[PDB]
């Protein structure tokens, strides 16, 4: 044991906890200055004793060297697409079809309702709690290795906040740029005669395609986790909301507007509430993602492969 290894371990634990409070809880227990005091105290100490420097330390988010290009990553579990609706009647028909298709329909039929963020879908792998890899969705089967870019995102933890992390956990979410960040970026890019972005989605896309993680770090990007891919060495909750709550309890950012709604009429109230709140969120959304909350019912309903919307095979008993 040394005093150095101990004060580095203590600084790291304290800083990760403050990052959680600030980013995930939105309830920091200390001022921004106090966090910074300890941050650059850890950074200096690590540089004075580089033998105790760790790859997942809060000070190691940004690569010093710009990359040559992005490698391609084939997802172990493919990243699926979403069905869409454009009206109340259309949404009700989607629900009436689920009601008929289920063996046993429960009363109530609970839905996990979330805002649909207007960002870029990503996959982040944590191996024994440590961030090792991150990929763009790409075409749902193959994507690009953006690990260095994802590591710069302030609300993305380099290590899970748990003493018993899964053997492997793949977190799936949307990377996006809030309005304030988007406005500052364009004001800076205008005042420095550089490329301005038409909308926050385009700014987030361009920032994640940046080969120099030093530029991505200057881009005000945010992750909101929506799902889980690989999950080994853990018994995941049996509902979708509880899985998002579990992700949040181990340090992962999830959207705070998520709610549970029983039946289509409650689900439609949520949709109208998010539509009215839309003008005050501080980030772009283009709809609401409505999911069957019970995991066993999701497994029963399963998925539909790439198929036309104009045909159906009505099978005989």
Ligand X SMILES: CC(C)(C)c1nc(-c2nccs2)c2c(N)c(C#N)c(N)nc2n1
Is there a contact between 172 and 225 (Cβ–Cβ < 8 Å)? Answer: yes
Decide which of ligand X, ligand IWH, none touches 116; Cβ closer than 5 to 8 Å per partner kind.
ligand X
**36 interface partner picked from ligand X, ligand IWH, none, CB below 5 to 8 A per type:** ligand IWH
Angle CA(256)–CA(164)–CA(150) in degrees, nearest 5?
Answer: 50
Instruction: State which residue, 20 or 176, has the beta carbon closest to ligand IWH.
Output: 20
User: With contacts defined by CB under 6 A, how many residues of the chain interact with ligand X?
Assistant: 12
Of the pair 14, 298, the CB lying nearest ligand X is at: 298
Mode of pairing for the β-strands spanning 130-136 and 72-74: unpaired
Give 115 or 157: the residue with its C-beta nearer to ligand IWH: 157
Burial class (CB in 10 A: 0-12, 13-18, 19+), 69: exposed
Distance CA 256, CA 154 (A): 17
Shortest distance, CB of residue 57 to ligand IWH, whole angstroms?
Answer: 14
DSSP tag of 127: E
Q: Kindly identify the residues of this chain, within the stretch 133-192, that bind ligand X according to CB under 6 A.
A: 137, 174
Site residues for ligand X, window 72-91 (CB under 6 A)? 80-82
User: Which of 73, 121, 254, 297 forms a contact with ligand X (CB under 6 A)?
Assistant: 121
Binding segment for ligand X among 35-43, 109-117, 180-188, 241-249 (CB under 6 A)?
109-117
Residue numbers in the known binding site for NAD(+) are 32-36, 81-82, 114, 137, 174, 291, 315
Is residue 116 within the footprint of ligand X (CB under 6 A)? yes
Neighbours of 19 (CB within 10 A): 21
> Minimum CB separation from ligand X for residue 296, in Å?
16
Q: Give dist(CA 48, CA 99) in Å, integer.
A: 64
Catalytic residue among 116, 195, 248, 277: 116
Stretch that binds ligand X, among 45-53, 68-76, 92-100, 111-119 (CB under 6 A): 111-119
Closest CA to 275 of 93, 109, 87: 87
Nearest to 130 by CA among 79, 57, 226, 78: 57
Residue 8 or 113: the one with the smaller Cβ distance to ligand X is 113
Q: How far is the CB of 161 from ligand IWH (least distance, A)?
A: 14
Assess 267 for contact with ligand X (CB under 6 A).
Answer: no
- Around Cβ 31, how many Cβ atoms within 10 Å? 9
Q: Would you tell me which residues interact with ligand IWH (CB under 6 A)?
A: 18-19, 21-22, 28, 30-32, 35-36, 154
Q: How far apart, in whole angstroms, are the C-alpha atoms of residue 270 and residue 272?
A: 5
Whether the CB-CB separation of 200 and 180 falls below 8 Å is answered with: no
Question: For residue 108, which of 298, 287, 267, 290 has the smallest C-alpha distance?
Answer: 267
Q: Is the peptide bond before 240 cis (omega within 30 degrees of 0)?
A: no
Q: Does 227 bind ligand X (CB under 6 A)?
A: yes
Known catalytic residue at 277: no
Active site residues: 116
Kindly list the residues in this chain that would bind ligand X in the complex (CB under 6 A): 80-82, 114, 116-117, 121, 137, 174, 226-227, 289
């Amino acid at each position: 044991m040394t005093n150095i290894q101990t004060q580095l371990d203590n600084l790291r634990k304290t800083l990760r906890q403050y990052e959680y409070e600030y980013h995930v809880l939105d309830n920091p227990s200390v001022p921004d200055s106090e966090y910074d005091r300890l941050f650059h105290q850890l950074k200096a100490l690590e540089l004075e004793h580089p033998e105790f420097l760790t790859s997942d330390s809060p000070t190691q988010r940004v690569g010093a060297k710009p990359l040559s290009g992005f490698s391609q990553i084939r997802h172990e579990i493919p990243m699926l697409s979403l069905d869409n609706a454009f009206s109340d009647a259309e949404f009700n028909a989607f629900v009436k079809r689920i009601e008929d298709r289920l063996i046993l329909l429960p009363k109530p039929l609970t839905f996990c309702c979330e805002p649909k963020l207007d960002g870029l879908a990503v996959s982040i792998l944590y191996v024994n709690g440590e961030l090792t890899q991150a990929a763009t969705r790409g075409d749902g089967t193959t994507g690009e290795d953006i690990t260095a870019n994802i590591r710069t995102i302030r609300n993305v933890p380099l290590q899970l906040l748990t003493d018993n992390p899964p053997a492997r956990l793949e977190v799936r979410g949307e990377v996006f740029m809030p309005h304030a960040g988007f406005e500052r970026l364009n004001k800076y890019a205008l005042e420095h005669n550089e490329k301005t972005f038409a909308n926050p989605r385009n700014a987030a896309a361009g920032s994640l395609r940046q080969l120099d993680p030093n530029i991505t770090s200057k881009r005000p990007l945010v992750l909101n986790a929506y799902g889980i891919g690989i999950a080994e060495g853990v018994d995941l909750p049996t509902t979708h909301y509880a899985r998002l709550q579990w992700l949040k309890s181990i340090g992962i950012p999830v959207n705070p507007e998520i709610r549970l709604c029983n039946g289509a009429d409650e689900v439609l109230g949520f949709y109208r509430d998010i539509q009215n709140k839309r003008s005050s969120l501080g980030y772009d959304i283009d709809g609401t993602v409505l999911k069957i909350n019970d995991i066993a019912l999701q497994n029963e309903l399963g998925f539909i492969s790439k198929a036309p919307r104009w045909a159906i095979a009505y099978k005989f008993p």
